[PDB]
Amino acid sequence: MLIAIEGVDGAGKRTLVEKLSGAFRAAGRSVATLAFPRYGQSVAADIAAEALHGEHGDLASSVYAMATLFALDRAGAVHTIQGLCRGYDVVILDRYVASNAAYSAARLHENAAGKAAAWVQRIEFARLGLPKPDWQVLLAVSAELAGERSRGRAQRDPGRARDNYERDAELQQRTGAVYAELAAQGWGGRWLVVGADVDPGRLAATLA
Amino acid sequence: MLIAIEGVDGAGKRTLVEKLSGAFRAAGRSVATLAFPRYGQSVAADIAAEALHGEHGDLASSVYAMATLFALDRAGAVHTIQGLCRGYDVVILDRYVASNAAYSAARLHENAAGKAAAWVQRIEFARLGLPKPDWQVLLAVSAELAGERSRGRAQRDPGRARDNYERDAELQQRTGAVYAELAAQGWGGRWLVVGADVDPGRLAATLA
Ligand SMILES: Cc1cn([C@H]2C[C@H](O)[C@@H](COP(=O)(O)OP(=O)(O)OP(=O)(O)OP(=O)(O)OP(=O)(O)OC[C@H]3O[C@@H](n4cnc5c(N)ncnc54)[C@H](O)[C@@H]3O)O2)c(=O)[nH]c1=O
Ligand SMILES: Cc1cn([C@H]2C[C@H](O)[C@@H](COP(=O)(O)OP(=O)(O)OP(=O)(O)OP(=O)(O)OP(=O)(O)OC[C@H]3O[C@@H](n4cnc5c(N)ncnc54)[C@H](O)[C@@H]3O)O2)c(=O)[nH]c1=O
Ligand SMILES: [Mg+2]
Ligand SMILES: [Mg+2]
């Protein structure tokens, strides 16, 4: 089974991916994880973030370029994903294709039914042939509270800092909104909108 | 030996690569070719050109994004290039890293000593570890005459058309200028500035 955890920055995905990765393990089913972007493994992923940190000329100023880099990263991750799906019983992804739709759409003040989202559908699932997730958990958390975790995170870590997207609050809010629309319409597969107080034990029982 | 043929659009590279690929063969040395962008083999190469043909939102509007795609293409071509260098006696490239420097710089009205060119040096040779060519032949042809070949080419072929770069004459002219500066300063390796009337037989005798 292929599960993808989605949500704005500082929402708690990394951790949910941890508490859920353990909930399934307490069930005999082997679990595997992979987080996107694949920093260090994908040059495109690295170039994308460094750009989000102010590098590589006018790169980040192009919504579609930034989207392409995150697609090209995953593209190089197709055999790997499939392998994981074959080997392990469960595979959890910290961010997946839905992220490109949510952020790209939000950057263009478009809604889930917009062109950017449709564009991500066409390039990633259809064209790059990236497997669609059996499940997409939208860890929904207010844009204000989520921003607080992003700010605290940058403050608690010396070699760290929010990027162009995390500094843009209105972007975070619109992405939250689009994430909500995508889940309602079950974009790329079925969605489950949980919360911070979601019980991993059950959530994992739901993911069958 | 690794040779790269460089030059503006409609300069005659594709053909020179042909007349030269045969000149070496008439010398017992095996020859191999590869043309960049690697259409069909590199998604990034395809996304780059389709963008140059008006697709993928605001992609092409970012000089560095377009540059990155052409870099990521070649990146995926590192083991292949090296293999070719090991196997064959001669390897000719229809466009290489110098192209990213020349066009990116020209798009930004920068000169060869500018930031875009230095950026291509840092990312491709240094970072992606793409091998530097023993030779870089700058097939120099007036921007006016070269534009004529691009226009004629699009006219003689039904499923074809000049792209954003080929339609931009001033861009073609500035690229020619920057190509000239790069050759004089021997960017990325040594350069040989020939001409349309260059004798393949000799040119190949020069490439030792
Ligand atoms: C997968 C995906 C993501 N996104 C968007 C969503 C996000 O806004 C953004 C980053 O994706 P992310 O949500 O995983 O979030 P990050 O902040 O990147 O991830 P982390 O949770 O790991 O952040 P940290 O800040 O803890 O960790 P760090 O390791 O410092 O990560 C930052 C990276 O950015 C670059 N970076 C960091 N510091 C840098 C510096 N000083 N100079 C240059 N580059 C720098 C490096 O490449 C580093 O790996 O990408 C999309 O639009 N589409 C997609 O398909
Ligand atoms: C390698 C490199 C190149 N460039 C710049 C230089 C050029 O301005 C431009 C194209 O690179 P090119 O010089 O090889 O030139 P092309 O015109 O791409 O090559 P050809 O000589 O093969 O052109 P043709 O027009 O004969 O052939 P075609 O096969 O039609 O090539 C066009 C491609 O563009 C897309 N395309 C073509 N028609 C399309 C259409 N209708 N809709 C969408 N996309 C379309 C497709 O991906 C196709 O492969 O890229 C850089 O800036 N940096 C680099 O590192
Ligand atoms: Mg982030
Ligand atoms: Mg061309």
Swiss-Prot record, chains A, B:
Pathway: Pyrimidine metabolism; dTTP biosynthesis. It is an enzyme of class 2 (transferase). One of its GO terms (biological process) is dUDP biosynthetic process. DTMP binds at residues 9, 39, 70, 74, 95, 100, 103, 163, 165. It catalyses: dTMP + ATP = dTDP + ADP. GO terms for molecular function: ATP binding; dTMP kinase activity; metal ion binding. Transmembrane segments: none annotated. Residues 147-159 are annotated as: LID. GO terms for cellular component: cytosol. The record marks 153 as: Transition state stabilizer. Its cofactor is Mg(2+). ATP binds at residues 7-14. Mg(2+) binds at residues 9, 166. Its EC number is 2.7.4.9. The keyword Nucleotide-binding applies. Binds 1 Mg(2+) ion per subunit. This ion is required for catalysis, binding to the active site transiently (at the TMP-binding site), and probably acting as a clamp between the phosphoryl donor and acceptor. Homodimer. NCBIfam families: PRK07933.1. Catalyzes the reversible phosphorylation of deoxythymidine monophosphate (dTMP) to deoxythymidine diphosphate (dTDP), using ATP as its preferred phosphoryl donor. Situated at the junction of both de novo and salvage pathways of deoxythymidine triphosphate (dTTP) synthesis, is essential for DNA synthesis and cellular growth. HAMAP family: Thymidylate_kinase. Belongs to the thymidylate kinase family. This is Thymidylate kinase. It comes from Mycobacterium tuberculosis (strain CDC 1551 / Oshkosh).
